[PDB]
Target: Serum albumin
Amino acid sequence: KSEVAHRFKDLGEENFKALVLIAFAQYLQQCPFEDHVKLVNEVTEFAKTCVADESAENCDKSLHTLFGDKLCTVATLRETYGEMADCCAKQEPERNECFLQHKDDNPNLPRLVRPEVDVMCTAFHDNEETFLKKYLYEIARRHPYFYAPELLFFAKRYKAAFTECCQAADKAACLLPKLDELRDEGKASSAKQRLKCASLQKFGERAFKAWAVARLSQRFPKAEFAEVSKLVTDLTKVHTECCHGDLLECADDRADLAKYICENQDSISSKLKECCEKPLLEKSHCIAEVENDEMPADLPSLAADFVESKDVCKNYAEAKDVFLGMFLYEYARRHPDYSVVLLLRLAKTYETTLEKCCAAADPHECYAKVFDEFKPLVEEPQNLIKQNCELFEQLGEYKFQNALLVRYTKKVPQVSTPTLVEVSRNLGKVGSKCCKHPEAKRMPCAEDYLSVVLNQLCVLHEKTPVSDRVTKCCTESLVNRRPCFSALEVDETYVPKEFNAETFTFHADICTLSEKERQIKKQTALVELVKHKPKATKEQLKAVMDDFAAFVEKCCKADDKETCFAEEGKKLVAASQAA
Model:
């Protein structure tokens, strides 16, 4: 009742100031930092008046109308943006949905360089408000879908890193690992979220709600159906708001939801003790990541209530959505060893059968062996898991990746080179994540990390589409993306693309570059190699590839006029078109 004020009171200025900063950051990505700070201030001063008098001019207005009006005021730079200006004509809810459509999932922003360590540690004490506020903005404008309250938590942890490491006996030794653990954590944290958002925005909330249901029931298998639905609802709400740009209420509701949980901990899950003792940001991050609680021991079989019962069709027709939710919750709670997508497949599979039976000839008879149809759908993933993982240990993550650059480039050569590189690199990072574990823990680990990663290629791509086959797989089902993609075979259509001269020669700036980032150019070359000769190709590449790896190492220790990079670059560009 005057909202800007309400949300300011619940959260306090720092967050309030930080939250808006992310918003603007996230929409106006090609906007330089001061401009945002200014807008934020105007927004923050204005908010405070509404704290004082609820009734004063525009305090009642919607947060999005408030954001929006402000966003309309100097998007008048479209000279550097373009056609987000269109949207200023339309009005709520139209405009915000029009805006969100222009979120750049891959902006042309200079790779954010980090300076020497003294320098960062100096700039901390000079102005630390600015230092962290810039931390937000640079991260935020690059990851425009980020789960906002989490950004905060990182920010907290980033400050924790500097607050200590600038007085560490050896600054850089404290600092770097911590920051790399942050650079690492965030990237994962951000993609997780991107999935969530896209499902809400392409597939809808009924689709998300199942997601939620399945994965919560796995988390708190002790808890009752009535409890979980409650959580799912509220969880859905939150994420709807953070995807829909509604950042302030997103945050507020998230921390309302942390609180309801920590109170109702014997009605939920045993293992919440440890999260719920911690501060308000730690809390939510923690419960976000709680390990799967002890499942109740000796539970009935489902068939009883979902197969043999002779009210099945009547209760299905009566409340299909609740009946299916209750089903899913049941099968979910008993299978933390299945992936969410699989449990999800099976609950869609049970739906489609019940739809087939309830009006046709003999319901008990046709649906009676529903559980039999699951068996195939269960085994298919586990097979593909084993296969990859042995491959992972045989090769070592680096080699494994390369191999996938092969699988995929050949499978879909039309797609951009840096896209394949990243996407495959991360697809490799699954093995480092999941093969670690035993085969209880593996399937949900890998298949749910994969969903995340294939969605990355999906949205990275939908930007400027080049392959229809990608475009198709992203489109049809969410659950069945991994299957769909798994299916593709080497692209016969594809005419092989010419010959870059300079793409296959490298300068001596390469030696200044790190391990990862040396390998990263190598992986780029590998993508371009197959974009070129898909034809006569097997491990004859591994030959030409080790050649690049080697000659790189030799040339960096040659004390030359950067000679053999350029000069013998001509040797290998001619000798490779042979080999």
